[PDB]
Amino acid sequence: QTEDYCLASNKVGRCRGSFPRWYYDPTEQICKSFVYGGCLGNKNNYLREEECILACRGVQGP
Amino acid sequence: VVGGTDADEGEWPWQVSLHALGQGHICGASLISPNWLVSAAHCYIDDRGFRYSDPTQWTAFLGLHDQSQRSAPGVQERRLKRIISHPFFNDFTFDYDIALLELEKPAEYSSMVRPICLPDASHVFPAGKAIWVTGWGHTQYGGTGALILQKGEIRVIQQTTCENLLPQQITPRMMCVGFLSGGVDSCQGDSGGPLSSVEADGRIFQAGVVSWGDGCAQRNKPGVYTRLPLFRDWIKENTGV
Ligand SMILES: N[C@@H](CCC(=O)N[C@@H](CS)C(=O)NCC(=O)O)C(=O)O
Numbered sequence: 359q360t361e362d363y364c365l366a367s368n369k370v371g372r373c374r375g376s377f378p379r380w381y382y383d384p385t386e387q388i389c390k391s392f393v394y395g396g397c398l399g400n401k402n403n404y405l406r407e408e409e410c411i412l413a414c415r416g417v418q419g420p
Numbered sequence: 421v422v423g424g425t426d427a428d429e430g431e432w433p434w435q436v437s438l439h440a441l442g443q444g445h446i447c448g449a450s451l452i453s454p455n456w457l458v459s460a461a462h463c464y465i466d467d468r469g470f471r472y473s474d475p476t477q478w479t480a481f482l483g484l485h486d487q488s489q490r491s492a493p494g495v496q497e498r499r500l501k502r503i504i505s506h507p508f509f510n511d512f513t514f515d516y517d518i519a520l521l522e523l524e525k526p527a528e529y530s531s532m533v534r535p536i537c538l539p540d541a542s543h544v545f546p547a548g549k550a551i552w553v554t555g556w557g558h559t560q561y562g563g564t565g566a567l568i569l570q571k572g573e574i575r576v577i578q579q580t581t582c583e584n585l586l587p588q589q590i591t592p593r594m595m596c597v598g599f600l601s602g603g604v605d606s607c608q609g610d611s612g613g614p615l616s617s618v619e620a621d622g623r624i625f626q627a628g629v630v631s632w633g634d635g636c637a638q639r640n641k642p643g644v645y646t647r648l649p650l651f652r653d654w655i656k657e658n659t660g661v
Pocket residue numbers: 529534535536537538622623624625
């Protein structure tokens with residue numbers, strides 16, 4: 359569950375929009391920006407930096 | 421656009437930039453009349469607690485050249501009045517990936533602001549023909565957008581070839597445009613923008629809408645575009661254009 363929301367690597371997907379998003383990088387325990395295509399993303403995909411930080415606070419690679 | 425060059429100022433006066441609130445540029449669109457734009461349906465789908473389908477959330481920039489000069493002379497800012505996503509749009513297969521955007525207030529025609537021509541339903545953009553893709557999207561996949569509007573010359577690919585490159589994924593609504601070599605292609609940030617085709621008297625017609633791809637500019641993964649001709653009537657019915 360944190361597996362999907364925090365440990366999953368970022369997925370741009372196939373659609374060609376440029377949606378600025380945030381993913382959690384569990385190697386550094388820090389939320390970073392990426393660009394989402396618009397389609398079929400995973401759960402490690404957040405609108406706001408603070409939403410990312412919040413959802414993934416205290417999360418480490420298992 | 422990967423592998424393109426800088427566009428000349430006002431070379432593509434139908435190219436529009438769509439900005440979502442507090443997010444900057446999301447998608448391209450094309451000007452088709454004083455009141456309407458054509459774009460991709462996938463740009464305007466509600467997601468992660470933001471209403472991308474809500475017309476009030478967007479700003480359109482017409483006659484834009486440089487994303488860092490949004491207040492340059494002749495750039496026209498326009499709010500949206502309505503968003504019509506195609507009824508048959510499929511968010512899993514990307515079928516019917518087309519949308520219509522109503523400007524709140526008519527565009528003012530100028531040398532930088534001018535509509536693109538629409539093709540009749542029976543018109544074919546023949547395989548092998550050179551056409552142009554334009555946009556402020558990434559110049560590499562997983563890369564960064566361009567401030568200056570990019571243009572890239574690509575070629576129409578046979579449907580059978582297209583089907584075979586991307587098995588079980590291509591519908592009659594979709595068209596492969598690019599090169600089997602890759603190198604030149606649209607990319608993230610280009611969605612919803614027009615394919616521009618130089619026709620018999622030099623006037624430019626819209627061949628398609630930037631939709632999707634397997635990365636960008638990769639070998640045997642050309643860009644997939646929504647065809648325009650089969651939507652001519654749907655466009656007329658909904659807009660009067
Ligand atoms: N003279 C017309 C303008 C006609 C026009 O802008 N045509 C467009 C739409 S068919 C066009 O040729 N655009 C494509 C191009 O310039 O190549 C007016 O006063 O509105």
